[PDB]
């Protein structure tokens, strides 16, 4: 065993964290309190390399492991996790799969740009009636000729409209029920494929969430992703990939919070003392400090499981489900410690309160995650 | 003893659940989003009796018991709980402390327009040094002829610049401490009399949080409220009523987005079935519901007490402590059971959990409710 | 609303801490440490009155109410639960059920010497397969001329041995399922009844539990209680009042607790002062103090509307689950508070605490009782 | 990162649970209820090498690292957490101190017959009124001639009476306060050293925890260890270590306990499924299960940093403080999870519980470990 990063890895910690200083930080507050998405950003991050961190340079990535990226959306997320699961959408859930199940025409086409920051990468499973019951997919892709002619629609996707790549999943059998599901590779502006409802959130207004429209979409054949009928098993291993991702913003969130009340606590004078000098908070702190801590090695051991090419699904679901539990108690007791002033807009501690509850429910509720870890506990 | 409900308590429960139906429920979704708190609405409120319901008839109220008003202020926060706590404010806070300490001029002046409800009322004792440390009070108030001069400002007024009387606090002799603060009633429209910030909070939208400015600020003489020298007990005993509001609040919080997830997961259905049929839920919902009904009764019994002319202070302290404590782990878990639908604003739970937050801060963050607690525990 | 006891309720309460303070305070330890469980002293509060405070002074009983039976259980067990546990048996779970469903000849011959404290009573529905799932019985009845001849055995039975009185349950018609069990009253010394196992606990040792066995076992055909067939009826009704008892039970355990480590906080001094006044522990303190009242409120309504005659089985329930968490949560607490010498035997924490954790499982287990609330909670 | 063990690791680790299956495992349940600290069961553990594990081969040591020690600790008390304890206090409280503060010739002396096995250890700090305030020695040690004469007496020590070398902290120089406490290397069998109470604990009934008395007792003047003034520094870094075999003790116990929950679950049916079949025992033990995971990296974190030579003491009182928390919460469900059966002696669950408890409090309570990790969070 050894707890200490990799000089990778620290390089790639520290150029996040300099990244976020200098053009999150700055502009954050500004952009939740209008619901920015700003294109102009994004694009910055993806030219400073982060979608491209754990891909092969032959893929016009990095080269470099797991667990660098996971520490990169980590510490975005101690910012504007908004950002962060931009970037962990672009490539837990989107470049991810193409990486994984794609050609090598699909590859060098769709992974590379997403890799070298140009584009931007959606993924596309939830319907009005398939959420946790994932499998009950509606949406239909029928082959005519040299296309796939989709029907129906996805909701809340994760840099819907504004990505220039989705993965997308419609039933080709609907007889073979969760084995007649398959994947697709869109592109934004292929006829038949349009944006509908914006989502307005309790919070991450600084990320994008849409509902997907097809109507007779016209998908090259070619774009079918994996075989016929994989498309499930595709959905699965990138959500798999995708809980570390959420389970690293959590995270963040988490620290950014903690990080936020110690300062204030230690400025903050009531009683001619000031607030961290009150036991009860102290306590308070300790406890948020430690859950930290204990969430952050649930996730590294998550992101390097997966890099070492073992199984991780159980892994993953055990560090989302506690870290966004972790996120969700931090956060509130952050926005305590702030007192009145924490329920105001300018103090940073309701921003973190209110992105932390989706962390809870997104890339799988945390029912599912239960199920996941159940299961995998109580198996023969 | 008796759990059950008086008939006057059961009419004002009925009342105050049709005045919400009517009047609330068919905007409140749009008053929340737009950030609105609607003068006329919350005259509408008064007309309907709900201000005067436990003041006295030769004082404009009803002659009712603080139960049945207690009661209201649950049942419109199941529905609109930014205009519960204008009610509340306007009554517990504001009219209550000219009601038990008042003259009677100063009762036929200044409460019976609230009881009546043509008047809403604002009690100002916070200032940026002075949250917690409510004695550390910076603001002044100088006798000279026939008006005290006040010097000062407050934050974080429940319905500040709307209203129209204001109970505020200032110290008339600071080298007497805690013992040289004095009470006030105050006028919109007094000469150096203005308003500041509003703040933009995380929830509360349907209630408005406004700084309080007094430059020179003139105010009768005759407008001291008790004795010079008194106004802190004033603060505290205004204070102990108060937290019985915020508990009766945070109570139906918890009640308005129980029932709006057991509504949603009787007719939400994934796998086959209602998302009511699998037992994590269930168990959930049983916990919430459980949680629900031991913070009733503490509510209830502090209010009864008060009603009695008994000791209420620790009863309102652990109301209000439990019962915030409540509504924000069951309007978290709300959240959760309607899944991503729960997280946009066009579901009811998001609004729950924001406007749950702010219960476990005002009248007192729930670490003073621990204050007050343990002193009397621990007391000898 | 009213929630002063009446002069009966305060009468008995009064009776019942008299009762512990001479009779079950100076020998607890002495009997907790040799496991005993006293018949002189469980025959001295028969004595006094307890089994019979809640039935008809026609069936050898007092005449009050629920409450007051359900305060006298609560005032013992802040004491000595294993006695408080041993009367709540007697009353709720044996003789209640002779009360409701028995006939004149029975309620005089088996009922009136439970209420005038000559005999003590017991209820065997648990079997080593038939535990929450209890309708699952193997026990058999089968009518042979005047008596039914009874084979099987249960497990786990309060006052088992001991009692002279029992309430059995055994399948009368197996094709029948839940409609083919029928109640019996045995007693101890009938042919073919015997006892078996006593067990050893981690906690409740001033409790007896046993194994019952019948072998060829001949009940007396008029000792069937209530019809064929009805006696999983008669099970779950009594189990609904009994869970009154447990929730009792564990209030009394959760306010001897803490009423404990108070005194012992205000007495023991580190860092030359008492552990009452660290913050941690004030606090710790008045959450210990907030739960236990939150907690009284849901067991006492529960035992009105018994008493009222209304549906009390959803509150009986609640109180039931809360109770006991909030006991093992309290005791595990009150432990912490005495530090080293809460962990030994020579202070009284730790027989609280072992005391609590059967309070979550017998009468039915929480994850039952969750069942009961959430059934209730979701019914249309 | 590298979260996988290294070779030696994994080798103490299977030694350490082959050494648990062939000598704790047959005997732990009779050991426990008799209350039997088995000298000779201990000496075949440290024949077997387990108290030299991460000592020097010149001390008679293996010669490997911290890892490996604390895994042995935490599979011992997967099955016997008093024989856990005892290696812990042996090797972290006393073998430690001696190796890092003694001379050449004191190591020969006392270290290495620790680290061959053959001799038991015992850390004698807490008094009276010193507890939490260890600071506040009122044992005395006065240098006349070539002796130290001690007077005083030490309660609540591991392995006391038992232990054949102790080390143990008297005043030298009472005004200089903390810094006027000396540590000496005592042996059992020094005139005027005697042992008191026995303590008959809740759980642990397989660790011996005796009082120290000294009356007089004569110590070589070479048998102080470090300077004069020294003690307090040697404590407190001892005390770093020791809160790294609690964490792991703790660590056990939850796992040992979970893994009996899940074997369980798996083989118990009610409703005619095993009883893992119901979801909220699923969640309740992947909620377990998940625990556990995020404690062992706190524990082997604090490990390694130890063992680097880096600062460990906040990673230590983290790790305590967590899987402490853990192993009450985990033991408590686990119980549950066997029903009734988890309430009697015959099935392994109350044990568990019984022993968790003790984890919360020694070796500094977890305020002590909340004061530690709130100093470093709030340091500057
Ligand atoms: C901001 C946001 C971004 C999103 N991003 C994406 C995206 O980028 N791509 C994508 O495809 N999807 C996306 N989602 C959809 C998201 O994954 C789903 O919301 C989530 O899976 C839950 O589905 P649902 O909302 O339909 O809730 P439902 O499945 O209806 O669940 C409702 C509740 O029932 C519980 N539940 C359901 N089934 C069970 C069961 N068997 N046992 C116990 N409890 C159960 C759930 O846990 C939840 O608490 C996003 C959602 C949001 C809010
Ligand atoms: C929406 C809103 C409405 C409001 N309405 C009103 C109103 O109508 N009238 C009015 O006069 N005021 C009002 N308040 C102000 C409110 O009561 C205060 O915010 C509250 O008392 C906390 O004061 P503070 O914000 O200065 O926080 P602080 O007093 O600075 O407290 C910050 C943190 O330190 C903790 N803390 C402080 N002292 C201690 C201690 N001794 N021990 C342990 N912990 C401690 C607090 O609990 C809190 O967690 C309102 C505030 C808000 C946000
Ligand atoms: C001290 C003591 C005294 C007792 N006194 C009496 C007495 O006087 N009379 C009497 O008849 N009985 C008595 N009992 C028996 C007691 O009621 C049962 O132990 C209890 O009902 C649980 O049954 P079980 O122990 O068979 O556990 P099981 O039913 O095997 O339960 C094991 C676990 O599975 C859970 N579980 C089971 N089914 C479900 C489900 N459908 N969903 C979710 N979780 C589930 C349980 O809650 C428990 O956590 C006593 C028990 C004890 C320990
Ligand atoms: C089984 C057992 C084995 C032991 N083994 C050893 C051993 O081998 N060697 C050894 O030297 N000692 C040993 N101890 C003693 C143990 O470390 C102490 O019991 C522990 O430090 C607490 O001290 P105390 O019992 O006096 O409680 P106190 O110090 O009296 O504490 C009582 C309560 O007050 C709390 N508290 C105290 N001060 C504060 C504060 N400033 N802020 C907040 N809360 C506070 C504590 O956390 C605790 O909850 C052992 C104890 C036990 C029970
Ligand atoms: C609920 C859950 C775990 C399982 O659904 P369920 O209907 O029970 O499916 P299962 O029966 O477990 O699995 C069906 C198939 O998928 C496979 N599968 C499941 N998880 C897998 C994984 N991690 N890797 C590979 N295959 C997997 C199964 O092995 C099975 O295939 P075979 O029968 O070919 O072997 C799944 O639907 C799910 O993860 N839902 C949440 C969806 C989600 O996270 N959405 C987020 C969108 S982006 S915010
Ligand atoms: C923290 C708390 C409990 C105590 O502050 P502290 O500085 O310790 O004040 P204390 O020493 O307890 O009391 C000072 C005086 O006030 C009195 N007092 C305190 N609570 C009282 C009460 N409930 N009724 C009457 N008098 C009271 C005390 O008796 C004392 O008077 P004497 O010196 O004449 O005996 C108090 O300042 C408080 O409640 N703060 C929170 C403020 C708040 O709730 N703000 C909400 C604004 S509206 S959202
Ligand atoms: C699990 C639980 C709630 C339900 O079991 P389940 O097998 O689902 O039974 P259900 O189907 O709910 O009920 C079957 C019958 O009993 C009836 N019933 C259930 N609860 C009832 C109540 N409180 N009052 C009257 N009838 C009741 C039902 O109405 C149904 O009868 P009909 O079909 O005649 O209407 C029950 O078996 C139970 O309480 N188990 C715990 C047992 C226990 O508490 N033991 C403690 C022993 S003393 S320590
Ligand atoms: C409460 C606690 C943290 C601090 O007590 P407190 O009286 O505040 O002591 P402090 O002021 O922090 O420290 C006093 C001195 O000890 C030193 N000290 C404290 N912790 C230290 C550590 N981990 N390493 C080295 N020195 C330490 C301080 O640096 C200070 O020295 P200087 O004055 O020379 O700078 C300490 O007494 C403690 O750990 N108590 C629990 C005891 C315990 O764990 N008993 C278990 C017995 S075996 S079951
Ligand atoms: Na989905
Ligand atoms: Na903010
Ligand atoms: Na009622
Ligand atoms: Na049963
Ligand atoms: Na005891
Ligand atoms: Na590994």
């Not at 101690?78 to 989107?94: E, F, M, P, Q, Y």
């Not at 939830?126 to 949406?139: F, K, L, M, N, V």
């Not at 016929?228 to 959905?235: H, L, N, T």
């Not at 903690?258 to 607030?275: D, H, N, P, T």
Request: net charge negative.
């Amino acid at each position: 065993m050894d707890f200490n990063l990799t000089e990778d890895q620290q390089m790639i910690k520290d150029m996040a964290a300099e990244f976020a200083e200098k053009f999150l930080a700055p502009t954050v507050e500004e952009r939740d309190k209008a619901h920015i998405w700003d294109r102009k950003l994004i694009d910055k991050m993806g030219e400073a390399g982060f979608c491209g961190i754990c891909f092969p340079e032959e893929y016009g990535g990095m080269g470099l492991d797991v667990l660098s990226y996971i520490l990169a959306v980590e510490e975005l997320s101690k910012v504007d996790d908004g950002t962060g699961i931009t970037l962990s959408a672009n490539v837990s859930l989107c470049a991810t799969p193409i990486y994984m199940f794609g050609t090598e025409e699909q590859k060098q086409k769709y992974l590379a740009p997403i890799a070298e920051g140009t584009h931007v990468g959606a993924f596309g499973l939830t319907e009005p009636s398939a959420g946790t019951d994932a499998s009950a997919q509606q949406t239909t892709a029928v082959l005519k000729g040299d296309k796939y002619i989709l029907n129906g629609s996805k909701i809340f996707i994760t840099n819907g409209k504004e990505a220039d790549t989705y993965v997308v999943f419609a039933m080709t059998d609907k007889s073979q029920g969760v084995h007649g599901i398959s994947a697709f590779i869109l592109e934004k502006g292929m006829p038949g494929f349009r944006f509908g409802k914006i989502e307005d959130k309790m919070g991450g207004h600084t990320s994008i969430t849409a509902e997907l429209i097809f109507e007779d979409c016209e998908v090259p054949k070619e774009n079918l992703l994996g075989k016929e009928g994989e498309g499930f098993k595709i959905a699965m291993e990138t959500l798999d990939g995708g809980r570390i991702g959420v389970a690293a913003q959590a995270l963040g969130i988490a620290e950014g919070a903690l990080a936020a009340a110690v300062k204030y606590s230690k400025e903050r004078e009531q009683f001619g003392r000031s607030i961290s000098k009150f036991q009860a908070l102290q306590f308070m702190m300790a406890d948020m400090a430690t859950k930290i801590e204990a969430a952050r090695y649930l996730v590294y051991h998550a992101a390097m499981l997966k890099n070492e090419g073992k199984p991780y699904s159980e892994a993953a679901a055990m560090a989302k489900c506690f870290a966004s539990d972790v996120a969700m108690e931090v956060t509130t007791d952050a926005v305590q410690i702030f007192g009145g002033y924490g329920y105001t807009v300018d103090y940073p501690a309701e921003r973190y309160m209110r992105n932390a509850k989706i962390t809870q429910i997104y890339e799988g509720t945390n029912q599912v995650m239960r199920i996941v870890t159940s299961r995998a506990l109580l198996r023969d």
